[PDB]
Amino acid sequence: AMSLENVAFNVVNKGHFDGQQGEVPVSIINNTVYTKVDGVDVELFENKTTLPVNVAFELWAKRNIKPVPEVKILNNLGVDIAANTVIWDYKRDAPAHISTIGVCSMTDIAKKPTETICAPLTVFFDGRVDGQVDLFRNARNGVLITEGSVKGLQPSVGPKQASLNGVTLIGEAVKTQFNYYKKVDGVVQQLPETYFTQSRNLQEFKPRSQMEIDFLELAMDEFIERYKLEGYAFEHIVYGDFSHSQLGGLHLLIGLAKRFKESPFELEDFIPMDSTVKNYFITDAQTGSSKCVCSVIDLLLDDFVEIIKSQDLSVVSKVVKVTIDYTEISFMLWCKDGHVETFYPKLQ
Amino acid sequence: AMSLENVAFNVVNKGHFDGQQGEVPVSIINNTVYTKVDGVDVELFENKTTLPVNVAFELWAKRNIKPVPEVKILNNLGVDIAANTVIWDYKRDAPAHISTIGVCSMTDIAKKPTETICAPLTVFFDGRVDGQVDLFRNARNGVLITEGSVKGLQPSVGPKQASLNGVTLIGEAVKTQFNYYKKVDGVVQQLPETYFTQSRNLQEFKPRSQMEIDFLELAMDEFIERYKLEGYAFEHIVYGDFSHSQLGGLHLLIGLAKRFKESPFELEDFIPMDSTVKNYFITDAQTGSSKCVCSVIDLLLDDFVEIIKSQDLSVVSKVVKVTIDYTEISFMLWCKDGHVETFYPKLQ
Amino acid sequence: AMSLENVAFNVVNKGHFDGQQGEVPVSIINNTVYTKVDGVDVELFENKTTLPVNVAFELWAKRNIKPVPEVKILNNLGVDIAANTVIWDYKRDAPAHISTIGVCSMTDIAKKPTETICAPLTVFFDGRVDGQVDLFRNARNGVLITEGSVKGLQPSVGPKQASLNGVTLIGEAVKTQFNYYKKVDGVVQQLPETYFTQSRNLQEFKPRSQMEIDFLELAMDEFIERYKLEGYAFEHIVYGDFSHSQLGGLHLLIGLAKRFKESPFELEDFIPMDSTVKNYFITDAQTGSSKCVCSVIDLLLDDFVEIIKSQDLSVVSKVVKVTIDYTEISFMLWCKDGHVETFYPKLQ
Amino acid sequence: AMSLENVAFNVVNKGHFDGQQGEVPVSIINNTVYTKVDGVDVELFENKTTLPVNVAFELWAKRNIKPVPEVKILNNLGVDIAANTVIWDYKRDAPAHISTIGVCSMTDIAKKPTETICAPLTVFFDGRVDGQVDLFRNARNGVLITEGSVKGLQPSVGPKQASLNGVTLIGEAVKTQFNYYKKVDGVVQQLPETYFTQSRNLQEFKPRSQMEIDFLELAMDEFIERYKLEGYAFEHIVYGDFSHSQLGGLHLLIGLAKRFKESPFELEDFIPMDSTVKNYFITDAQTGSSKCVCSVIDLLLDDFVEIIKSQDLSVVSKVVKVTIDYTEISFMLWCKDGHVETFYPKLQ
Amino acid sequence: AMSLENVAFNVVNKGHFDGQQGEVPVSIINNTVYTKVDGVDVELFENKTTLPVNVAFELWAKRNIKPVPEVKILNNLGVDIAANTVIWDYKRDAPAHISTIGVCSMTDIAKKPTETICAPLTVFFDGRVDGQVDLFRNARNGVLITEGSVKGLQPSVGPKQASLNGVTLIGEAVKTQFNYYKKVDGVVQQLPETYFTQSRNLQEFKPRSQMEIDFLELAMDEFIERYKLEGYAFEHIVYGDFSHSQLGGLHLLIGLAKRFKESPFELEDFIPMDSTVKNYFITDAQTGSSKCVCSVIDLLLDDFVEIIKSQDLSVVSKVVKVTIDYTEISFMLWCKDGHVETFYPKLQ
Numbered sequence A, B, C, D, E: 001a002m003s004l005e006n007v008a009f010n011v012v013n014k015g016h017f018d019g020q021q022g023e024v025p026v027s028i029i030n031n032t033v034y035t036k037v038d039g040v041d042v043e044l045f046e047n048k049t050t051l052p053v054n055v056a057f058e059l060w061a062k063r064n065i066k067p068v069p070e071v072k073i074l075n076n077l078g079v080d081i082a083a084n085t086v087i088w089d090y091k092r093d094a095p096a097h098i099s100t101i102g103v104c105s106m107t108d109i110a111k112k113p114t115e116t117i118c119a120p121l122t123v124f125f126d127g128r129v130d131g132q133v134d135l136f137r138n139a140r141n142g143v144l145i146t147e148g149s150v151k152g153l154q155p156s157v158g159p160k161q162a163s164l165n166g167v168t169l170i171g172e173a174v175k176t177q178f179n180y181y182k183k184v185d186g187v188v189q190q191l192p193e194t195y196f197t198q199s200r201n202l203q204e205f206k207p208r209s210q211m212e213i214d215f216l217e218l219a220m221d222e223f224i225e226r227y228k229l230e231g232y233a234f235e236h237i238v239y240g241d242f243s244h245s246q247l248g249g250l251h252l253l254i255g256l257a258k259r260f261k262e263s264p265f266e267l268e269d270f271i272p273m274d275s276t277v278k279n280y281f282i283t284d285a286q287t288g289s290s291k292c293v294c295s296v297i298d299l300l301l302d303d304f305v306e307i308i309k310s311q312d313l314s315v316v317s318k319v320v321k322v323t324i325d326y327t328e329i330s331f332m333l334w335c336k337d338g339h340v341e342t343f344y345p346k347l348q
Ligand SMILES: Cc1nc2c([nH]1)CC[C@@H](N)C2
Pocket: B334, B341, B342
């Protein structure tokens, strides 16, 4: 017996939608939901979505509050809709998927993922919810996450991290590393071997290996010496070159993190969404070196070193395809005289 | 068990709020309420009020659908709020009263008119609803309407017309003429002797007396001759003078109705509300004669003739006070040599 | 001493801005201005302009309430701005000019038209306002209207009609026919010989000549016979042809007026503005004949007959230029075997 | 002589409303007030309230800029309206009270608190303003704050801190500790003995006692040993338990402050208002331990220790009522074998 | 061939408008521009301007991405419009100028600065763009910036810093120090000798001289002793006095930076725009000392010392005019017994 006043009651009393009975007085003014708390209006939600304010309010209240795969993973795996949940995209302040299944009467295309409208869509199934592994077995298309083994299904160990209420973390009290499964046209698909992005921030960047500790602590020329990275253009690619008007390289998040402690810079996130590779309009405050489209990827430094060291440096230019987060990322490799000139996530 | 989805269900299925159980999917976009009817959005209500869209939607759905006193009457009688109903003001497209009693959780100041918050307010009571005559008897301040007699209380016969769903009419299938009662500070008032405005339209003006039939049918100088109105400036006051740049007189609706069949004109309702006297910015299309503030009152022609013929014509200018719709209307009487120059509802 | 509350006071009490002192409480919600009248909000103005709501409110309140030249005339004469007034465009529900001179602090580019910012702009001067004839004499660029003669300047007799509060009319109580003057770069221009559009409505179309009375009263083939219009394609041009899917001709308002009494039709005003020639997407309800762009002009039938009869009918197609409302109107003349096929205001 | 343009002049020149004469050009676009500063619009205020934009602008400009009681105190004391001032709620970006007295023509219910409409409302009086102690003596309901003694009135020493322009602080240059007085139905009410919340932030938490310094500096088991807190479940209640999926305890702000220096966490303020007890949807970033409704109170650690040590630990479960900020806060005390299991601010 | 979908394509692919061909699907909802990225809407721009959302989107995309003069400089130099570029004001989130020249069809007043509409306007010319020095030579009014010498034109060395994408910086990889030129009425104007503001932040304030290092490191009385500033009221002016309810002095940014490390305070930027002198409503959190209008200027401490030491201290009060950023800043100098009492940027 769904209602705006019941959704608001659940938000106010339970912190989110919890199936409780009750109603609070609500007022809707433009794109904001308010509730009366002893005579005055208190803001409950500001709609930042392209959906009607009361509809977005309901989807946000009904968001999955368990650790869930990051939106970039779900997108790279071709997920269209989730089964009986809402994956809230905290990067966009909006639902990650346009439609719902058994969540909200306004956005629902079906009450159950077994209805024929869902057959051509890649439905997201959560093995931690009763009956969802079975629902995935009947689904023509879908992506399944489990905490353990599913008899007969060959698993794909996903990233260590998951999003819990907008917080990307590697769980200690909760499990965040799932097994992944995919189905395309009724056939289970073998998920490729892949690297995973680390999902770290610039403000709170922490090294996750000895190489990463040595990169952040050592000087440029001695880190390169220690790790035998001569001829691999890490000075340009990872460290970044701030000597010319156009900023050179700076494509690994760890190199942006190292620069960040010395001097600050602006990263304009002109397409604010979750993705494996992020494009930024970067302006370095110290030097004034800038770049309109600077592709940045957060790979573990060891993974990036393994990728670049596994390439043939005999051709002037070529497209190098690397599977990261289940998606094929094209990198442009530019070589001269048997050494790397530049290696960057290719701008389409 | 109030909710936006239940109110919308009632609107869609019952034409208005009828206490039925059920919910329809609703979407709110800016100031409009929509409902999904087979995949597409159908508009249910556009908010023209200063209240939040969902709150105004609820008050409109919960409007009184029985013939009720016109807002101008309720306002002239000093009504602040209604007991367990919403008097919808169709002239303003808004609730006639700011707050409610037992109607809507957002606007309610009390669930019952007996709660002390209502004591200082003039509560509107409807004798056609069970218990409201007794609630009025116990209330400190209030206005009561009944279809018949009330033991002990001396009645005041109200206007013949009432508003039914925005349509002002003299009922044939329904009673529209009520008895009026008013209590201030616990004391049953003796309501004054009063004329009533006729609440007619310009497009569908109908005469309600032989004098009114003769006014609309006869030529100016012969109507005045028949009714001995020489020296009362009806040529200026009622007929209107369109010979100069500023339109002369034209203060009685019947005279606007007579002009309307011959030639059209614009009446700019710059304060769109229900009131005993209406101010219009009038532009005559035929002649181009115009007036920024032309006060217009709809009195029965016989009543207006009785008012003007009961005045002393010996002073240049004076304020004439007439009780119309229970309120004191000031008129400006302008005389010269024992004859009327003009007589108009005072602009104050 | 300008203010939102003072402008609202003037609207409420004087019908428009009248320089009176006082303030009323105002509330602004989105694009609507409201005022509190005894506890409740009453709508004073809905902004339909691209200007801020309070700024448009002020310009509308400060509109010229005397008969003024129609916007199409002012536009055809190249008027940019008005001197110390606001010409309200009732067709667009907006000010006719972007900026003001001595009207509103937000839109003013100058307090007086003598300030150098006004020198390159064609300032509209009203000879009925003291000093404006002299201001025009000293202005580099301007358009002047007078009711009578101006010493030295040779007049151009304007159209008989003017707009008074949005009502286009030929004044009887007020003068609406002005003398026109125009100065470009300091030189008093000789305005061209011109026809004038009649500015009539379809709902209340009135004939302004014996030919126009005969057109509306007589049958097609006998009006053409009486006025010797054989070979001039009036059957197609003025009467209109509703026999095919694309509606033929119907370019003179009088012919639309004649059809309107027999059967109704939709005129979609897809560019709602005042102009000499109007484009309509017309759908005939009776036959279903329609046309996406049907140019319609309101010329006096005698003027249109004089124009078409003064053309050479020897070429297949040519552009015929006619001065209407001071502007050059291109028409397309299409002939075959020495007779007109069609003649329509050119779609360019 | 109140106006939008005068309020804006005061904001621009005086930083707030200061009763000065003058006007600046203002433009209102949706919910934002702008002023023209040399050709361009500069934003003066963005409306985050449920009031009309120009009305909220005026109330914000007319906000009390002297140290005033925090909104939670005023709410706990039952304050409805303030006398001749606006208490701006910086937590909600809105006026703390719906209506005003002698502040703004749109929100005013009276010009003076002596008018009968104010009698049933708890009016806030400021003894630092001339005549307000007298006004409180005549008020049927009210809350009075003074800097010193009022003859005959028994005082209540309030919290040390007050809000000055949104900044909660313990004054050094200004007095922030007031005497409190309350009247209910014409009778002065004895304010209960109470603890006061400390109103500290997580980002800038500072200890206000030796116990608080020892809590932040010492290790868990040695702080408990020093202060003889064995059996009082401080490990769960104050320190917090991050070992399970549902976060255990963590109900004192000081314990959140201690965790904050080690590792970060998200506190979703789903009811953003000022209150004695705050509810947060907490997600710990390090462990992934989370809780939908985690009640957090900022008591001085010594005060919290005194409360928990003054309870009988012989019953399985009971409601413990503690007066904090003048309000009775219910705490749920859970005991087993003569020791505390948990003690939390009870979720209604 | 300008379009909303092409501007959005350029934003998405090039980080800004780069003249590329292509279109992306766009959706406009209220004041926000969105683009569809694999089924979902991703926000591209939120309009904070008084221009229509699609028009502001285009101007922002077409912003100058090279280091440009800070808006305060352009304003102080009387710049009205820029030639064939948009100077984005990052302080206001809006275009610095109302109209454009050859940028956007909606805001353009001309396609080239040579058109007569531009003659009376001060056009901003960028010597780094081909043909703009010539355009400045033909311009009746204008401001020119160059990186080097212009034959015959006497230069004015501008500030060391420029804004690059909102980041004020002293360029190392790019040139930020320009030569300035101005023309008024066809005549080149000699730009006065001027000091320049340093454009530093409170959060990241860095000293730019030994005196500034000594000010931040030394104690008050010993800095004054070292620099012989006895009798110059630096204790009040630069250090600030927090002992009374009204905060004393604190008019140099460096003194606010020194206080900021010890204790925090609120600076309410009630006129959020870029200007030489900034007015703040300051509330000191530690003491509670506050000031409604506290003028703050960021001069190099040596420059401020040179200004105050170059004044005659013999008069009680006088206006001291100092050229800063090309504008004449009035300072109020107050002296007693041959010593400074106070010296502040004069509030008009
Ligand atoms: C408004 C008004 N003023 C006057 C009239 N009407 C008519 C008679 C005159 N003495 C003066």
